[PDB]
């Protein structure tokens, strides 16, 4: 779409308004956001499968993997569909996201509308930890907050 949002929220007051703009069927998306309630430091950020509560928190399915690759980040050879590596939280526990991608579509085959955008405690290990868990998740640990990607309104 040309205006999508994902309101992150967790067990605690950790919350974050993510924004996504695509417009173009096959153009570079802009993705950005601003958490409020993480700790400082790097936090893994990914599009988990779908709004699947049974996966643990309010919703957080496995790392979405349509092409069935190993985990990593935008700069890796092995990166899943929604492997937006990690973001950096401030000393005030705010991680201002601002990146762009061309794998997804927000409106098309890879409509991210409906997906489950989740933040992790630890840094994404860029799926290089040489262990399934890491090479599937980034060893980023438990999901401080979870959320769903929808239309901005
Ligand atoms: Cu994740
Ligand atoms: Zn991944």
């Amino acid at each position: 779409a040309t205006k999508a949002v994902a309101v992150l929220k967790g067990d605690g007051p950790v919350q974050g308004i993510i924004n996504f703009e695509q417009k173009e069927s096959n153009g570079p998306v802009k993705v950005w956001g601003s958490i409020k309630g993480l700790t400082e430091g790097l936090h893994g950020f990914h599009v988990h499968e779908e709004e699947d509560n049974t996966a643990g928190c309010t919703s957080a399915g496995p790392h979405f993997n349509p092409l069935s690759r190993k985990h990593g980040g935008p700069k890796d050879e092995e990166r899943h569909v929604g492997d937006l590596g990690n973001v950096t939280a401030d000393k005030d526990g705010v991680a201002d996201v601002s990146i762009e991608d061309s794998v997804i579509s927000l409106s098309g085959d890879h409509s991210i509308i409906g997906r489950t955008l989740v933040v992790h405690e630890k840094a994404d290990d860029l799926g290089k930890g040489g262990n399934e868990q890491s090479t599937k998740t980034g060893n980023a640990g438990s999901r401080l907050a979870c959320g769903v990607i929808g239309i901005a309104q």
Side-chain angles (χ1 to χ4, degrees):
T2 188
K3 55 122 182 178
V5 75
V7 306
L8 266 64
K9 225 159 281 160
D11 186 79
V14 52
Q15 74 204 353
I17 298 94
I18 307 304
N19 313 97
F20 290 94
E21 300 188 332
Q22 178 92 26
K23 198 184 240 77
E24 231 69 67
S25 36
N26 298 95
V29 92
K30 257 276 172 180
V31 42
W32 83 82
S34 47
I35 231 117
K36 207 218 81 188
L38 265 309
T39 180
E40 53 124 307
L42 271 56
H43 285 290
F45 242 95
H46 332 99
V47 190
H48 290 233
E49 206 103 83
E50 310 193 65
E51 214 265 304
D52 189 58
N53 186 22
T54 187
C57 72
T58 187
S59 268
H63 271 221
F64 203 127
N65 205 353
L67 289 86
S68 213
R69 308 223 110 81
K70 278 156 69 289
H71 184 54
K75 285 237 175 68
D76 294 327
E77 240 78 315
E78 279 180 324
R79 70 187 192 199
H80 313 136
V81 69
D83 278 4
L84 309 179
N86 59 54
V87 306
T88 303
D90 288 341
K91 51 123 291 211
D92 240 278
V94 169
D96 272 28
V97 197
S98 279
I99 202 153
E100 49 193 84
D101 198 309
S102 305
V103 178
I104 85 307
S105 322
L106 227 184
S107 30
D109 311 63
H110 305 283
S111 178
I112 66 166
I113 296 292
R115 304 285 152 74
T116 299
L117 184 53
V118 186
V119 69
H120 288 266
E121 187 187 83
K122 311 227 72 172
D124 193 309
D125 180 47
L126 278 269
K128 58 135 191 255
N131 147 107
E132 273 68 10
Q133 219 303 131
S134 331
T135 59
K136 179 184 76 183
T137 64
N139 195 44
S142 290
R143 292 151 244 169
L144 274 259
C146 305
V148 65
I149 312 186
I151 310 180
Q153 197 200 11

